[PDB]
Amino acid sequence: DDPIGLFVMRPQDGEVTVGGSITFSARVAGKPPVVKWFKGKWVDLSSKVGQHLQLHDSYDRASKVYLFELHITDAQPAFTGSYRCEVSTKDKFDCSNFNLTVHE
Amino acid sequence: DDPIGLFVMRPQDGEVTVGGSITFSARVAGKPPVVKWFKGKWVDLSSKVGQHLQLHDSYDRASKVYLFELHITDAQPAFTGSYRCEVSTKDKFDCSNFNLTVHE
């Protein structure tokens, strides 16, 4: 099958009900790789952190895996749409598309 | 499995003998999507077109698929390495990592 990129685990499509919370994540094998999350081509979600959105990055020493999380909270209908996770290392770039659907 | 991105067909890992030729390609469902090919993070292969490297983009009307090709010719040992295909549409971005190994 397909070449192995940077994503040990890609972000997945998700569904949430209005007012609900949902987490998206990515894992990258092990400087730390650096993540960016986007809605659409150009909206950098780091600029949107607040009551509805939070980011958290961590590292598991045993497995040598880096975890990147995107937390959506109190979901609103406008959050529905197309998202992208981008990761960079000293030597590579990769990215991964996924979708969020907000119901109700 | 994983969310559907822009790649109907991702570029694959390839192997070639020195002096050999090899083609890498990507397919994207249907302005045309626009491709960039890289070696490493930053070398834009459009700037390297010549006796060893050529690019060709086309469209199949029946299937509505766009094809992006990277042709490597008279392969040299230094061409071995990590490559990336990036594609953009009006609404999305995606990319795909792959490797070339030159033997002998």
Side-chain angles (χ1 to χ4, degrees), chain A residues 1-30 32-89 91-104, chain B residues 1-30 32-89 91-104:
Chain A
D1 237 345
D2 294 320
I4 296 150
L6 289 175
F7 292 92
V8 172
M9 187 63 196
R10 288 179 180 279
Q12 302 295 300
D13 292 334
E15 299 186 45
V16 70
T17 294
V18 172
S21 291
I22 180 173
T23 298
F24 293 103
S25 60
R27 285 160 162 95
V28 176
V34 180
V35 79
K36 290 221 273 232
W37 301 85
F38 296 80
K39 191 175 196 203
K41 281 170 79 178
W42 305 123
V43 177
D44 183 345
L45 295 177
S46 63
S47 73
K48 297 288 198 173
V49 162
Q51 147 199 11
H52 284 115
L53 192 149
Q54 292 283 324
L55 301 179
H56 187 79
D57 301 336
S58 57
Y59 177 67
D60 178 64
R61 181 168 42 58
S63 62
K64 292 186 313 203
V65 177
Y66 288 86
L67 175 64
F68 308 91
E69 296 171 281
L70 168 69
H71 300 118
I72 303 176
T73 51
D74 187 32
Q76 311 285 306
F79 300 170
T80 291
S82 308
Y83 289 77
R84 184 176 72 263
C85 182
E86 304 186 349
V87 166
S88 306
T89 62
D91 304 299
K92 289 172 182 189
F93 178 79
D94 205 352
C95 72
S96 205
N97 282 268
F98 62 104
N99 291 277
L100 170 64
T101 303
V102 181
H103 299 283
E104 288 212 287
Chain B
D1 237 345
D2 294 320
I4 296 150
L6 289 175
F7 292 92
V8 172
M9 187 63 196
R10 288 179 180 279
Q12 302 295 300
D13 292 334
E15 299 186 45
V16 70
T17 294
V18 172
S21 291
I22 180 173
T23 298
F24 293 103
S25 60
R27 285 160 162 95
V28 176
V34 180
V35 79
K36 290 221 273 232
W37 301 85
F38 296 80
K39 191 175 196 203
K41 281 170 79 178
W42 305 123
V43 177
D44 183 345
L45 295 177
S46 63
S47 73
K48 297 288 198 173
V49 162
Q51 147 199 11
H52 284 115
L53 192 149
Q54 292 283 324
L55 301 179
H56 187 79
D57 301 336
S58 57
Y59 177 67
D60 178 64
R61 181 168 42 58
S63 62
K64 292 186 313 203
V65 177
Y66 288 86
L67 175 64
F68 308 91
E69 296 171 281
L70 168 69
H71 300 118
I72 303 176
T73 51
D74 187 32
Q76 311 285 306
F79 300 170
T80 291
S82 308
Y83 289 77
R84 184 176 72 263
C85 182
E86 304 186 349
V87 166
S88 306
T89 62
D91 304 299
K92 289 172 182 189
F93 178 79
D94 205 352
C95 72
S96 205
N97 282 268
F98 62 104
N99 291 277
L100 170 64
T101 303
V102 181
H103 299 283
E104 288 212 287

